[PDB]
Amino acid sequence: FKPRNYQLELALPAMKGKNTIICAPTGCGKTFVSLLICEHHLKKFPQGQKGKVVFFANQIPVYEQQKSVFSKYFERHGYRVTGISGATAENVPVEQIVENNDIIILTPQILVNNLKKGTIPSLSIFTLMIFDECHNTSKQHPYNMIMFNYLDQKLGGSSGPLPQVIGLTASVGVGDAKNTDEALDYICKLCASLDASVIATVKHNLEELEQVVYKPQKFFRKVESRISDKFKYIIAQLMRDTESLAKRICKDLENLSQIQNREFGTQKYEQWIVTVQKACMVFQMPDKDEESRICKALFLYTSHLRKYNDALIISEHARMKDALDYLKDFFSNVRAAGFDEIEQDLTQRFEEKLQELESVSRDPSNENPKLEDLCFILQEEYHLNPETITILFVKTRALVDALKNWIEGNPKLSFLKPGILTDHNILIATSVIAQCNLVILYEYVIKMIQTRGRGRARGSKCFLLTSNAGVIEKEQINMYKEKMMNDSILRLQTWDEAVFREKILHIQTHEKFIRDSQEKPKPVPDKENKKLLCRKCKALACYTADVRVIEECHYTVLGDAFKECFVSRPHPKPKQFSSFEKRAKIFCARQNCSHDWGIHVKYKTFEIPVIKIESFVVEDIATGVQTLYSKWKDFHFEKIPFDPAEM
Amino acid sequence: FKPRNYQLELALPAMKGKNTIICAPTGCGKTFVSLLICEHHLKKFPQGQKGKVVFFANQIPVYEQQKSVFSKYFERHGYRVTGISGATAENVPVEQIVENNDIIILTPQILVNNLKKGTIPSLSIFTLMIFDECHNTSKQHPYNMIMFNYLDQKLGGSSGPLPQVIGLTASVGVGDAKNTDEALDYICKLCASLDASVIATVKHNLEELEQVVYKPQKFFRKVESRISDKFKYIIAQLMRDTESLAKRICKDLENLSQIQNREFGTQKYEQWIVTVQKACMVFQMPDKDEESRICKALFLYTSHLRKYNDALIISEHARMKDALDYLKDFFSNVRAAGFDEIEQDLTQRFEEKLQELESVSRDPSNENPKLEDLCFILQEEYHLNPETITILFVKTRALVDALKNWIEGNPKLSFLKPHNILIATSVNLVILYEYVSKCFLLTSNAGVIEKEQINMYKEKMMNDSILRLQTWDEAVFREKILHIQTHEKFIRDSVPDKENKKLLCRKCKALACYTADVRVIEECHYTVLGDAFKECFVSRPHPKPKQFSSFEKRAKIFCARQNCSHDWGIHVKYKTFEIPVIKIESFVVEDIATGVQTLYSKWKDFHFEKIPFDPA
Amino acid sequence: SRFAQWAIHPTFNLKSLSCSLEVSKDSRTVTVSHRPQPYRWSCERFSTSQVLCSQALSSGKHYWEVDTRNCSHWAVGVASWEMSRDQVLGRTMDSCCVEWKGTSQLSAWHMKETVLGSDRPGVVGIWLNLEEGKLAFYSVDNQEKLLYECTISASSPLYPAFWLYGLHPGNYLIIKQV
Amino acid sequence: SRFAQWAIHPTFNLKSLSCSLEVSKDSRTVTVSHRPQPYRWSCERFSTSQVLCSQALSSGKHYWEVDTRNCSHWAVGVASWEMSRDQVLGRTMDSCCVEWKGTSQLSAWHMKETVLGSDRPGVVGIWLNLEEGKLAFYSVDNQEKLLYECTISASSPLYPAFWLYGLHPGNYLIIKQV
RNA sequence: GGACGUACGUUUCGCGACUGUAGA
RNA sequence: CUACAGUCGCGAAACGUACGUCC
Ligand SMILES: [Zn+2]
Ligand SMILES: [Zn+2]
């Protein structure tokens, strides 16, 4: 309700009428800076002329937070504040909201879709554009797709009343630069893509910035892995049996991939599984009955090796007991769905070593050494200060439940309460509010931006727990990349404003030349009629002459013969994206295939089985060759548009 | 003098008159099978026709070994055995030796030099070319330069009496292939470059070869490096202090080699040294008196950082006491080579922490753990039985001399003879000390373990690919290699200056000579005949004199300055006089008109006035 | 030092020291290192920053001196041998001690949650009279200021226990002469 | 096991333990692993594949049983406590022991390689009588066959030593009941 | 369903540096 | 001077997995 001295130095170049890349390290500081520019811009206009300041928000909780602030502030002055979201883009005309409002806080994804349709054909209707968190404008962003339409009007020759491109960020960033010469080239490339001339930073009011900065200290603690790994020895014997069982029907399995010697439980072995599994999907046996048996058996032998390799990464980071619960959960779901001769042999091979795996998991000397000292640093802070909140960042969602059950059932950590964010003493989140004075980075590699509240700092810690030298030396050079970022900003701030507007003017023309050179159109569509087969069973589903395109993104099937080829199943989390309503989920209607084919949605009145190309294989009926496409744009064929007049 | 059945199985396709890829893993079996093919080829010749079987030997001890056995075997039959080495073919006609003898064992590098001069205009004079170690015929080899004239004669339309290109080897090799379909292309590319179709191997007498195979079992011993690096902290403090006093001479030092934040004691630091050393050599100041002091100071600062980082790699792999010996040898060498204000700063600071480095070196607490398990496996095999004479393979020549101070310099190990333990750097209990019946492999990182693990996978896919080619047809084998030889022939068949530049030193930046006096001797050596260059250098005797067929390395040359002592080149005796043949690597070329400087490492990358030598 | 000397100084044992400390050969100077060390896995390992002793007590004659200087936060008191090692010192059934908490208050525990003022004793000495259960923290020079009393049910070995902040390297405690 | 029992089972100590052994909590089974163990560097470390015990000798009553099966090559014997640590068992001036060498010969040393035949004692049993110097190895069930005679000058601490082939994984010894 | 971003890991191509070996 | 082999680093390009966001 009352501005300060440091909240006026940042918005001082913004009130002059030029674009600024204001970087405030506070959470509510960026909200109060933007309100000062928004109030000053609307008051300087004479009668008849009105402002159309648009505040772009990247997320929906960021859109709903700024919608309450801008409505509880611009209400005594008589301004109209609205908001267009993904749930609000329908049932209203998009042209009539902009012409009858001033304080639109609509998301940038609707503006990119409208510029392709024809509604709001130019950005000359707006007078001010505010880009919240504008550091994401690097490549192909929805922030960048508006600037591609803005720079084409400035450097095109039809420039009208162009608006300001001010942006309130919190970290400008360097990228993948090694030296200051490349780090300087990233900031001028960001200033060229946002048409900037000024970069405001708090230099004269550093005393008030020190009160709210949230700067913790570094507490790197490198630990070692376990020596007596007996859980890995029993699992790796089952993986060698399954790899040998899959070689009885494919003698050239080692020739299908070009990866080196693989260790079980690593990331290099996971890439070898997908490369092998994609190589057995293009088999061309002319029997067409034994082909559906070898491709179904090799899909199950590669899926069990995928779950066996995934269970060893859980035992490497989390507890040994929770790794056994991941395999028993996978084998329970595969038993209830379907049973054949292939899956029953793999199920009974795991049950013969189940009692051996359950004995080494309940050993008090087989504790993970990463969890052995995580409990030690959690019981030393709570003995020192027992009223501290902490937070834990986990990389993989399969480990965020294993460390929740580790606390629930531990006598040394009986005071902690789970705060899983996949009356809460701990907070086990995956990826990020300025209330917890403890940060633990459990094997989680731009640092954590914990700048959300306008509170205090009070002293925080930044413990980094890892078991390899890659994560230790990565944070050591991240402090060097953050040190050279402030030096490259202060060097840019001591230049001349007349030459910096011409320095970025040659980057906007160079980047447009690359954008005008990468205009390669689509190739000739294959007029031959190919058919789509299943990925697990290789059964015939449909042809490429019954595929219709709804809105250049989604692909449905028109023919009625496909309607008896799937079975419905309800969605666990239905939602809507601007033209559809998720109601069911289609699967393969075979005996024991149960392959995920796509989804079932309602577009206007009908129900269309929208499928994906990641679960099919394209076989040409003329030659007989099979290919595996991963995206619908790479599949170049005759794309007939959908017509609701037929059915 | 008793050829067995498995020795006669390999020679069966060789006697038919076709080029073969016979490979044997033993030493005695490989030399004995070549004698049977050589005896059968000469006995089957009719009257009036003589053979010209040649034996291309790669090395000189391989040439000396194959000369005594071939002379002692073909002596009763009345054959003319001889040998043409590098120290033999000087002022001898090559055409006279090949016309008067039949069992020539001439070096293939001499044949490449002879094929360009005009003598022996075609390869049709030979009848049986025997390539020893034929697996080296991959790219630009002296074995591969003879085949560039063989394939030109065969695919040139005038192919007459071509000889046999049967090539002996010990391993076919895989190379840089990862799958069976990629390892198959490497073997057929070797037979295409050797113009052969049959790969003779043992498939019926495997019971004889298993008796003598020399194949031990592997044993991986991976350990972790030291953590209490008290020697590293004193060295890196001296290197960080030396780098800080080097930034006062050149202001823009840190932006020259921008790769990453460098770490001490690794190979990445060594690449940072040579890059910043070359950057201080292209400086151009118009005073020409302070510039000679700036580049002389920055050369001694970068060289002392090079010698400090060189001793750091020895401390992580070898004993700590040999790291100080490498530093005391470098400092005592420059103590008698010159003394200015720059080296007096670095020598006095080294003698300050000399007692600090001597104190930590004698304590056994700060010891590298790679020598601990090496000491553990030596006293464990000899404890079982005293018939376990060892062979140690060492890569670095500085690292094998550091191990000599550990065999008799340590009181625990005494039953060894530095004989009882071999220190051969290049060839029952074999220890692979960082080199990539039982074997061992000591290392500090997981890279050497994974590099040897895929080598056993390469041996598995090599033997599988050999038997796949042995079931093909002979008509399609010569047809497949015909498309390869025509493809490589197309790629194989696919400007001077007139300025006047001057040559300057790299650390002293003094005017030595100009490019108008540099002459060309035999398209590889560049000397200066001018009289102004004769006073700019000083002589120095060679520690190991030798010759290469036209010269005499009598003495080395050095820069004639006060404390420079830069390695400029060498002094040779070509025909009747002496000429200072120099190298372009330790020099700086500067233009008179432009003034910019350029750094060249090889003479072929420096295009300039190449005037031939004149004896007048 | 000034009164009648009644006991001798205790010594640290290596059978109760955790895997994080590197107590030296004098057995009276614990210190924290950067890297923890792999030790044995038994029921005597505390898995904390606590150190116990093995000096057997007597009828009534007990006194020892321990310096807690050059320490951020410490805790020194009396604990029994028949106690679970996973528990925290001062939170068990009967272990009274004085802990210098993170909020800069010299708190004291007894089986309660009472706190003392804002003092900071550098050289704290513990007087023990187990014949009638008397405890008094006469630290230094303040006319024998105790300011706290604990009643113990002495029917068990009661070797003195110690605690220091183990997440700060370079912290060390020293036992000196009485 | 059928005569009068005179002694008890020994126990391995952690002060003379080798840096490659991973003996469990029962302290009666030596086992070599793939990775060595990081221990302290002092004059008590053998830096070999040997181990010592904690049981001091007596007048005449010494007997224990040890299992030497599931092993490629082993060596069990008796050595003195005052012994240099860099030496291997069987080369000391007073160390009576038997070595199962790599040449499949059950050799023995008396400080003079006393080579014997090709006998293979599975579970060996060592008799010691320090009062009159009597040593005889009745291993298992072979009607108490001695097969070796040794005389010791027992006037020193005489803790028993062991040895195992450390270059082969899976090699392990176990002490059983007499 | 689709689009985008970040992080790890892998397969190549091209260039450069250093060490070692061999020959003339 | 030529040539081979090994290690390390600087770039470009393609692919896979995981996480998160929006329509
Ligand atoms: Zn299917
Ligand atoms: Zn010079």
Side-chain angles (χ1 to χ4, degrees), chain D residues 61-92 94-95:
Chain D
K61 329 286 287 187
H62 326 306
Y63 198 83
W64 41 72
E65 191 90 346
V66 69
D67 188 313
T68 79
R69 286 251 54 88
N70 317 336
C71 276
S72 309
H73 305 306
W74 49 269
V76 179
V78 181
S80 60
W81 174 264
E82 195 69 86
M83 189 158 78
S84 171
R85 254 56 186 174
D86 47 17
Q87 273 296 90
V88 64
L89 181 57
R91 308 305 178 272
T92 301
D94 184 1
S95 66

Side-chain angles (χ1 to χ4, degrees), chain B residues 505-510 559-561 564-566 568:
Chain B
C505 172
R506 274 199 155 197
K507 60 175 299 179
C508 173
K509 303 290 296 297
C559 174
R561 259 286 299 267
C564 185
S565 87
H566 197 54
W568 273 9

Side-chain angles (χ1 to χ4, degrees), chain A residues 222 364 379-381 383-384, chain C residues 35 41 47 99 102 163 165:
Chain A
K222 163 73 172 301
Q379 73 191 337
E380 279 283 325
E381 307 290 1
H383 186 212
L384 181 77
Chain C
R35 197 65 161 270
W41 207 97
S47 73
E99 322 170 301
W163 184 87
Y165 199 65

Side-chain angles (χ1 to χ4, degrees), chain A residues 238-453 455-504:
Chain A
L238 291 176
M239 302 175 75
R240 278 186 282 263
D241 293 359
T242 324
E243 195 173 357
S244 87
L245 196 57
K247 268 180 290 184
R248 302 180 183 180
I249 50 181
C250 182
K251 322 289 292 184
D252 52 326
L253 201 67
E254 286 275 348
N255 309 6
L256 291 177
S257 158
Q258 282 85 13
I259 319 292
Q260 307 314 320
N261 52 335
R262 41 214 187 272
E263 211 196 9
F264 297 135
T266 54
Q267 209 178 355
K268 197 189 299 178
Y269 185 76
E270 196 182 4
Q271 200 164 345
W272 185 84
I273 292 297
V274 188
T275 324
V276 157
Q277 196 177 202
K278 284 186 177 185
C280 316
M281 290 165 186
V282 287
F283 279 162
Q284 293 177 196
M285 278 82 73
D287 197 311
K288 306 299 291 178
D289 207 5
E290 209 73 34
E291 185 199 60
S292 159
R293 195 195 63 88
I294 304 177
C295 282
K296 193 180 170 54
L298 286 171
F299 194 84
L300 295 166
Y301 289 152
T302 43
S303 312
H304 285 65
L305 288 178
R306 181 76 175 273
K307 294 297 182 179
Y308 277 151
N309 181 77
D310 281 358
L312 287 177
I313 321 176
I314 303 177
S315 158
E316 192 178 357
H317 304 153
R319 216 168 74 256
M320 197 175 290
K321 193 184 300 178
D322 304 280
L324 194 59
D325 286 290
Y326 178 71
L327 288 179
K328 290 185 299 177
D329 185 38
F330 165 68
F331 271 105
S332 87
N333 299 329
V334 63
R335 183 148 46 188
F339 245 175
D340 48 347
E341 47 259 81
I342 308 298
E343 292 172 321
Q344 276 180 5
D345 181 69
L346 298 176
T347 308
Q348 73 185 8
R349 203 179 302 268
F350 178 70
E351 297 292 276
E352 290 176 0
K353 300 184 184 177
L354 185 60
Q355 304 293 137
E356 192 181 358
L357 282 171
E358 216 158 46
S359 158
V360 81
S361 83
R362 290 179 283 105
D363 201 284
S365 72
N366 277 123
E367 187 64 272
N368 205 303
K370 204 174 300 180
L371 294 182
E372 197 185 345
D373 81 295
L374 176 57
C375 169
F376 168 68
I377 67 177
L378 275 172
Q379 73 191 337
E380 279 283 325
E381 307 290 1
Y382 274 77
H383 186 212
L384 181 77
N385 189 323
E387 316 101 310
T388 68
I389 321 179
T390 189
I391 191 173
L392 191 86
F393 293 103
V394 196
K395 168 184 177 180
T396 298
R397 289 204 320 265
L399 303 179
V400 82
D401 45 39
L403 268 83
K404 180 189 176 180
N405 309 331
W406 171 63
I407 309 176
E408 286 184 334
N410 194 274
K412 292 180 291 300
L413 296 180
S414 45
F415 35 77
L416 292 173
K417 308 166 186 177
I420 165 179
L421 191 76
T422 187
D423 59 328
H424 282 341
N425 235 336
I426 213 179
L427 205 76
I428 325 177
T430 310
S431 88
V432 65
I433 32 179
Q435 304 132 340
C436 54
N437 49 330
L438 190 51
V439 182
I440 303 176
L441 251 53
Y442 192 84
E443 284 266 6
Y444 191 79
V445 305
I446 298 188
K447 305 176 180 302
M448 323 310 294
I449 33 183
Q450 295 283 149
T451 72
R452 284 299 181 268
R456 277 301 171 268
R458 304 134 298 181
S460 309
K461 298 172 179 60
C462 204
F463 281 85
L464 167 64
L465 289 184
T466 173
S467 78
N468 48 327
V471 204
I472 287 295
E473 292 317 312
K474 200 172 303 301
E475 281 266 330
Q476 288 282 339
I477 67 176
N478 275 15
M479 303 184 63
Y480 164 70
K481 287 167 62 180
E482 208 266 346
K483 182 61 180 58
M484 77 203 316
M485 187 187 64
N486 309 275
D487 293 8
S488 199
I489 283 175
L490 196 60
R491 184 182 287 108
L492 188 147
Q493 282 195 48
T494 62
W495 281 5
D496 183 38
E497 209 176 358
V499 64
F500 189 72
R501 286 194 169 96
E502 211 265 348
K503 173 66 185 302
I504 67 140

